[PDB]
């Protein structure tokens, strides 16, 4: 599923992401934009052989199992495929664990490079919330 901007903002709010670990909804929508362009089925292979999955491009080296990332962990205890669902529950639950890991949203490189410090509120502007 390819979410609309305000559609995803509403979904992320419903699932407890607004101000989670102090990160406003705009930060999460911005991260999703530049990680996946709001496409739940987005996948991208990394040079180390791990793969990023879903709207927030969660990685298989630590967070989910895809059965082809040697030495990896599965800290969210999910198959990576669960992160590709039209329902973002799995991605949100896992993202909450990631953002609590110590480095906040810096875990998402695209967030640090393209969202951090910017007017992230613009990503939820005009949206019914």
Q: How far is the CB of 15 from ligand NH3 (least distance, A)?
A: 4
Residue 43: beta bridge partners? 53
Site residues (CB under 5 A) for Pt ion, limited to 76-95 = 86
| CA distances in angstroms from 101 to 2, 7, 46, 93, listed in the order given | 28, 27, 21, 13
Three-state SS for 73-97 is CCCCCCEHHHHHCCCCHHHHHHHHH
Torsion sign across C-alpha atoms 38, 101, 117, 17 = positive
What's the burial of 103, exposed, middle or buried (CB within 10 Å: 0-12/13-18/19+)?
Answer: exposed
Using CB under 5 A as the binding rule, whether residue 88 contacts Cl ion is answered as yes
The token pair that represents 63 in the structure block: 């967070």
Q: Judge whether 48 counts as a catalytic residue.
A: no
Q: Judge whether 66 counts as a catalytic residue.
A: no
Total residues binding Pt ion (CB under 5 A): 5
Pick between residue 48 and residue 87 the one whose CB is nearest to ligand NH3: 87
**Pattern 12-41, binding to Pt ion, x per CB under 5 A?**
---xx-------------------------
Using CB under 5 A as the binding rule, whether residue 59 contacts Na ion is answered as no
Does 66 carry a binding-site annotation?
no
For Na ion, the binding residues (CB under 5 A) are 60, 65, 69, 72, 74
Could you tell me which residues are annotated as the binding site for substrate? 101
Residue numbers annotated as active site: 35, 52
């Amino acid at each position: 599923k390819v979410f609309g901007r305000c559609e995803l903002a509403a979904a992320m709010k419903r699932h407890g992401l607004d101000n989670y670990r102090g990160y406003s909804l705009g930060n999460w929508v911005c991260a999703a934009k530049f990680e996946s362009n709001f496409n739940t089925q987005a996948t991208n292979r990394n040079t180390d052989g791990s793969t990023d999955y879903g709207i927030l491009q969660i990685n298989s080296r630590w967070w989910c199992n895809d059965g082809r990332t040697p030495g990896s962990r599965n800290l969210c205890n999910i198959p990576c495929s669960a992160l590709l669902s039209s329902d973002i529950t799995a991605s949100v639950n896992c993202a909450k664990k990631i953002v609590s890991d110590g480095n906040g949203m810096n875990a998402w490189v695209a967030w640090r490079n393209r969202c951090k410090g910017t007017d992230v509120q613009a990503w939820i502007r005009g949206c019914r919330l």
